[PDB]
Paper text:
Bacteria encode a variety of reverse transcriptases (RTs) that evolved from mobile group II intron RTs to perform different cellular functions. In a previous study, we showed via genetic and biochemical analyses that a Pseudomonas aeruginosa group II intron–like ([name]) RT functions in DSBR via MMEJ both in its native host and when transferred into Escherichia coli. Here, we determined a 2.6-Å crystal structure of a full-length [name] RT apoenzyme and a 2.8-Å cocrystal structure of [name] RT bound in an active conformation to a snapback DNA synthesis substrate and incoming dNTP. All RTs share a common structural framework composed of fingers, palm, and thumb or thumb surrogate regions that fold into a hand-like structure, forming a cleft containing an RT active site composed of three conserved aspartate residues that bind catalytic Mg2+ ions.
Numbering used by the authors:
A (entry chain B): 2 to 72, 74 to 409
B (entry chain A): 2 to 409
The structure:
Amino acid sequence: SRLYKDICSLRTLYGAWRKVRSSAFLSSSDEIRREAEEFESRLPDSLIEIQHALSKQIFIFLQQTGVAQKKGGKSRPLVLAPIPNRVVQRALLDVLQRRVRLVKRVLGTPTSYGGIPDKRVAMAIADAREAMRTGARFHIRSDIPAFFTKINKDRVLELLRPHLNCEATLKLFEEAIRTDLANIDDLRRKGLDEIFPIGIEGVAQGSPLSPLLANIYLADFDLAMNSNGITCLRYIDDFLLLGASLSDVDKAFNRALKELGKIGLEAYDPRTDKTKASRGATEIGFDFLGCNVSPGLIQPSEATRRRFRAKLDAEFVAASHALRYNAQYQDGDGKYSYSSALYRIDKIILGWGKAFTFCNGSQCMIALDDFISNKLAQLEAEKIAILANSDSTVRRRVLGVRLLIDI
Amino acid sequence: SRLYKDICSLRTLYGAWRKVRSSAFLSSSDEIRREAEEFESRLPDSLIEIQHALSKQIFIFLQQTGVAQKKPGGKSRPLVLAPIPNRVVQRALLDVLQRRVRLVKRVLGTPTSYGGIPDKRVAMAIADAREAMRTGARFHIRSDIPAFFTKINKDRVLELLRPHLNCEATLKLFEEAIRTDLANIDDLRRKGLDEIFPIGIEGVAQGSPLSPLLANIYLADFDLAMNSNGITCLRYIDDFLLLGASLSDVDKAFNRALKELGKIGLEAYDPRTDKTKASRGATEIGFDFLGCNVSPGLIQPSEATRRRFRAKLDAEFVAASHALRYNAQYQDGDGKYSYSSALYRIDKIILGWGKAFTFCNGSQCMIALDDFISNKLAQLEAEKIAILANSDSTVRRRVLGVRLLIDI
DNA sequence: AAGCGGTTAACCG
DNA sequence: AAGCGGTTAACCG
Ligand SMILES: Nc1ccn([C@H]2C[C@H](O)[C@@H](COP(=O)(O)OP(=O)(O)OP(=O)(O)O)O2)c(=O)n1
Ligand SMILES: Nc1ccn([C@H]2C[C@H](O)[C@@H](COP(=O)(O)OP(=O)(O)OP(=O)(O)O)O2)c(=O)n1
Ligand SMILES: [Mn+2]
Ligand SMILES: [Mn+2]
């Protein structure tokens, strides 16, 4: 089977591993990094082993580890797997997306944008604002509660059996999407087992296949909803319905509830969940994918700016505490030294402002820059007060220039 | 042959490629890493091509590029930049020669040799020297070989390793790897820089992984001869220390060293004529070795090493002051030299340097260097307070180094 | 247009 | 103790 042969090819497996290591080497978890160093060493052989197993069809997905990601909703069920699992999983995604028509068709879908190669949030935001200015005068925006968890692996499998034409790739794909948690007993003891995809409901959050799986799951939804003069733009779970009449979108959301109902999914009702979903005249402006889409103006959603000001606020108080602490105290992290804090704050402004460069949030950005400018001025004066009466050593640990005598 | 089989191992080759990739991917050179990313793409095939060729013995080293590199003094480092396949096969050769060749493992093994050897550091040599002093070595001569890589003779190196390798194919690969062929030779000849590069049998390429091992193999006869008759010779690459009970014993040793070096075509800086490259005198008073000042009681960074550090730090502060003035009036700033970014980098320079001399015990000069830092620092604050007193918010953000969202 | 062997950003050849 | 897809470090799911 040429499809299966691609999966066992060393070009694919090394391509996949390149993708996996790019993450592992940066992992906060030392074990993941070191497991990757152990895989990077013996690299020709460490992938040939997998290639060998895959070829003789005796590859074994190792038991995973289910952890709880700090989360509004229930702690995200993060399924962390060994490197060979992640490598074989990333391999499957690469071969599926270049060789399977249904996959490329699902990637092709014009109204789907999340987790699709060559597709970005900005493109959706553009299409949305294009629908207004073509007769979109009202909206509903909603998302699927616990989407992955409610995804059914039996429906996933049944949709994929036709377009696979390789019973071996079917077995591999089947084992790829199972979750066998090795810490299951500890997880039962905390009463946490039930949120993980240990049964047929759910896909592993943390597998590379799951976003494709999700997008395949809503293939039917995407088609049904783009009809009746109602335009639906979906990024992952989030869907924006755009229409001429409030009545029209209201009915469409009702059709959506039935459409997601067939496949086990609900959708936050805008009137019921104003903080999770939205409804109204597209003119008032609406929040979508972190932007506020007004037809005159487009900018990051207030919540995104709020988050950003809160992260900035935290850093600045962190610095102030440190400036007093470093004076009169020998030990400091030095992360919060004036030099380090400003350096972090500068790169935070870079990283965030870099993603919103498409947005024109200038009235808001100037306020965010006004917030930063004021915060910067305060700390500067705060430190000069302390520096005004300070010996060289104190200023050194305050400013963040290490002392050689203490190394 | 097991030796050659080893070199044609894709695990051997990939190991070599990993080390080459780590260097090329951080390379300042536009050309060099572009070449490396392309090799990382197509990686599976990129290396089998080399493996096929190595197994077939059809492998061809490609033409290299010679670069005279400005060095302190009028001296130039003859850089030989090679294509990625050259570089991979050469690191492959090094990795195999150092794990399978008995002579090679013995040369790395020698106790008195420390440069470019795995599991070996400058401190281990400084420690060995102090012990020799503790057991009665009260006088020393320290010297260096001029242009050592340039004067090594490939034919002697081949003669030394030919009995040990036991494979004609390994020997042929080694000869091709040692050899230098330059694409840029006509341009160098017009320059007059052609002679510096190892185009001839004399010399070993700088920028080749093999060349540091070759030098250790070349000086192995010197290492045994020097460590005799009450004299301990400790060598890191070219640099050598002769340790003895009496000045006469060290003086006699230097003459012996020149003779051992002379047979192999090498020479040493004279301790009386050149203060910078050789020293002579009593170990009880201090002497410099490998950037350390080795006193029987105290070890510290050497005075030259501290001057470099003081200059590197001074440069950083000069740049910071200039940018302080520039980032106020203009917007074309580099930002690397903004107050926040400047102070942050200086801190990490101070980290890395103090980390290098943790094996030293002298605090007096560390304290004086700390004082100099605090002086330049407080000056820079004076310069920042001044500029910012007459400043709007936009200038304050450009000076301090907290970029504006508007300018993204 | 910037390379190599090595060490706990840096250091030594 | 920390994962995934996608995009010009971050953002969005
Ligand atoms: N860091 C990650 C990783 C994966 N996903 C995936 C899994 C979710 O099922 C899907 C939908 O995105 P949501 O943020 O809406 O996630 P949930 O549907 O789980 O949350 P909620 O119940 O709050 O809608 O996106 C995600 O959102 N965020
Ligand atoms: N950055 C460096 C420093 C040194 N070396 C190698 C090649 C040199 O020939 C050898 C000896 O180091 P020296 O610094 O003593 O250099 P030279 O012997 O070439 O010059 P000099 O006459 O100044 O001693 O170490 C190197 O490859 N790269
Ligand atoms: Mn959701
Ligand atoms: Mn020299």
